[model samples]
Target: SNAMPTTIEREFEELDTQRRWQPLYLEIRNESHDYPHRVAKFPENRNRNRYRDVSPYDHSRVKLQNAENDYINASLVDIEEAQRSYILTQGPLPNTCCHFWLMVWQQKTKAVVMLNRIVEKESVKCAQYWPTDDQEMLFKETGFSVKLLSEDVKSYYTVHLLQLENINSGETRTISHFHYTTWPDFGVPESPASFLNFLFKVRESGSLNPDHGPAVIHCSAGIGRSGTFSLVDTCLVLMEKGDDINIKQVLLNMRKYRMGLIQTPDQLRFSYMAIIEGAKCSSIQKRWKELSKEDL
Candidate 1:
């Protein structure tokens, strides 16, 4: 446990000193190349994918429940040692929005963690799948209705409460929508402070608990930004359990569940940085939990 922190910092320093980040990232790319995504390349499932090259591996892709074609561009990432599981997927396409909520309802997911915006660089990165407070969005194709209940806007992130109802079954569920607004495509957040704060806010919701279904985490392609979030969260969970973890190995294991995780050299470095920062000061937040009695 004691050596773990230094190990991370030493590795980070070495990478920074020798400018080995790109080569290190290339190593991951080369290692992950053999995984087959044949299912995503099938003629019938072609349009379901947001990016032609970005495809979920057949072994770990999430399949739609009880559908004829039964395909979606999503993957289930389970870190059993850390007891963390995540449904990492691409942002919904105009045609796939129905399937998006269908996957959410079928997975019994309680939260959707979005790491990018609907539009970036004057391009549409994702479909506006959910509704605003002023109106409700109904996916008649999938028999689902989404209504925004409340919104908590932070400087770089927003927490939205949404009501998801199955119009077919008339069953309703409240889903927590945690959106990181300022994260750029292929870039890291401004700092770990706001990122970790946003992460902890999601944890406080209990939506990520094992008792509920796995949370849905998505960026535009569901590989780069999505991978970083899952990797950092899984590493921190392991650290919180007093377990020694190799960040690279943890990411490698995560890549088994999905292809091309942590896309950029900068993202890989950011993951290491965030994990180190989170591990060092998570106790401060724990201490705050104890001091809440005083506030009460």
Candidate 2:
């Protein structure tokens, strides 16, 4: 006859992954909630002084600063702003159950699009380019709707461009959403440039309201690819202001808001490299060349 599992044994089993199982005789202990965790586990701080001296900006200041200033935007914000304005963060899986509910309450306008790499569930249409049987089952169990970019047909709803509109209390607002699933895997050097073009396209089509709604972006853990993309986006906007921005400082600021902004060591290295590549093809620099040649 098989032996019955104990409550303590079952709890340990819940934490096990495919590669490793818990030992039967291990003792479980809970630490105090007030424990101070080390923040430096992520990477060595290059600008330690700046990080220590800088304080989080006020909600109004942050909202005004990020409004239409695409280059300096981070997807996540303070819980306060999340209560009144919009909030963007890394992937919301494992931690958040009803992803849509969180956004609906916080953002007047909300939009979400799955990547080509993530599989679509029967509850939602899948884009032809990306498919995953595992994600399908996950979404099915979660009861969340997943849709494919191909079924959108309108092209306006592609994962590359997600739109959200809200009409409440006689006020209407629309928001643009961007999520890159294949960003880390593909490593497309030209993506930053392509993204700029896409943003411009959104502006031209009047789908994105630069003055009111900021673009909401996220990926698996809210760091890594998501952080890198957000950092580049912010730097580009700062460049537009004619401010000599430091890429390292921008990354540090990201970490302040979200502890693991860049997430992995490889992601940190990628952030610097992306900045170097982006600076070479800056939108402002391109604009300068175009204007100078027009008078000839």
Per-candidate alpha-carbon RMSD to the true structure: 3.8, 18.9
* Number of clashing pairs per prediction, in order: 0, 15
Model 1: per-residue lDDT, tens digit, 159-261? 8899999999999999999999889999998776656777787898998899999999999999999999989999999988988788878888998999888
Model 2 ranges with Cα > 4 A deviation:
1-86, 94-105, 110-116, 119-157, 160-181, 185-210, 264-266, 277-296
User: Which TM-score value belongs to model 2?
Assistant: 0.45
Candidate 1 lDDT score at position 265? 95
Q: List the residue pairs that clash in candidate 1.
A: none
lDDT (CA) for every model shown?
Answer: 0.88, 0.36
Residue 228 C-alpha lDDT in model 1? 90
- Tell me the deviation in Å of residue 63 in model 1: 1.3
